[PDB]
Structure 1
Amino acid sequence: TYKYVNLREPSMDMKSVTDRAAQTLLWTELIRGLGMTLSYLFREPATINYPFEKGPLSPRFRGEHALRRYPSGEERCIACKLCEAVCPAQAITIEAEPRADGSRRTTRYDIDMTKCIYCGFCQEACPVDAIVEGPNFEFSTETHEELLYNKEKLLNNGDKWEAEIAANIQADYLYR
């Protein structure tokens, strides 16, 4: 149930001693290493042609945050603040009020994407599937505060990516 790496005594007959001295003077293992590197020279490389080719992802992927709506246009979020209670980085800032039809909706929904650790606890704490962490990972900015998302940017990410977020949640809700 254990084994000894490097517990070999080399043989001391003239055959093995001459083999080791030919290895020493004639560099046999170095030609072995050159041959392994030349063997990789004639392989097709693993390089994909980004951005025209993309790295493979799963529908579980945790990328850019988005707020979803129902199939009537009403937003799913009912301001329950479970996502900001569970948030390990305290990246979510929620303020709410009853709006003009008495619905329980948010007035503030901020996600700091520079505090966010992209762990997806908010999407799995959400009881109505409102906050989701979508498929987009290509959202680098030139400014720090362009990553300080408010409710408008998150609802626009939902409206932007809903055709894909709905299919990822369709492919992955039965594992949840």
Structure 2
Amino acid sequence: ATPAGPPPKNFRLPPPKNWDEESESTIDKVGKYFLMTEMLRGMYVLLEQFFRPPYTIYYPFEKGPISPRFRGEHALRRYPSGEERCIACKLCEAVCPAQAITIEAEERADGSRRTTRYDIDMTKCIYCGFCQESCPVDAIVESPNAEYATETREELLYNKEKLLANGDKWEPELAAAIRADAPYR
């Protein structure tokens, strides 16, 4: 219970003090009992809080702080041209910790390598952000949007038509968060 070698210098406790060896005057000792002085001090600390500013935020008018690295709902982005950035490498499908991504790809009419299916089970996803660390083209991101509770969980099966619609909606904020964090990525 103590380490090997010599016992620690004064590890052993002093002998216990008898009641009449204690250094506390009866006046101090009896007063603290009947006046309940330590409980009075704690009640006074609550008066101090009473007259301090509160911590509360009025939501939804005032929001809490979120960093550029925040991990909210997924979005599929484009280039300035308008083409989808996604080229169907499937890296985000391989690294998914919860197997939430299902991708089916083929050759587009023009010969380009593009996805035909892009589904994200929002009820399987753990919001780790791994999908967006593995992208070679910044195609999949997680927007700062955390406010999308829905009614049915069928609404939480995002298909490629919803994830592109999300990127079109959120692009300025997505481009801004990428601009802030890119040096660190």
Same fold by TM-score greater than 0.5: yes
Which residue number corresponds to residue 81 of structure 2? 72
Residue from 165, 170, 173 that aligns with 2:174: 165
Question: What residue ranges of structure 1 are gaps of 5+ in the alignment?
Answer: none
Q: Which runs of 4+ in 1 moved over 4 A?
A: 7-11
Which residue number corresponds to residue 52 of structure 1? 61
Shift of 1:23: 1.3
Residue type matched to 1:131 in 2?
A: I
Which residue number corresponds to residue 3 of structure 2? none
CA displacement 1:72-98 (0-9 Å, x = unmatched): 000000001000100000000000111
How many residue pairs match? The answer is 170
CA displacement 1:17-63 (0-9 Å, x = unmatched): 43232111111011111011111111110001100000001100000
Which residue number corresponds to residue 126 of structure 1? 135
Q: How many angstroms apart in 2 are the aligned matches of 1:135 and 1:103?
A: 31
Residue type matched to 1:129 in 2?
A: D
Which residue number corresponds to residue 24 of structure 1? 33
The root-mean-square deviation of aligned C-alpha atoms, in Å, is 1.9
Residue from 79, 93, 98 that aligns with 1:84: 93
CA displacement 1:89-110 (0-9 Å, x = unmatched): 0000000111100110001000
Query: Secondary structure of 1:170's match?
Result: helix
Q: How many angstroms apart in 2 are the aligned matches of 1:34 and 1:168?
A: 47
Q: How many angstroms apart in 2 are the aligned matches of 1:14 and 1:108?
A: 79
Task: Report the TM-score when normalising by structure 2.
Answer: 0.87
Shift of 1:14: 5.2
Question: What residue ranges of structure 2 are gaps of 5+ in the alignment?
Answer: 1-10
State the structure with more CA Rg: 2
Which residue number corresponds to residue 35 of structure 1? 44
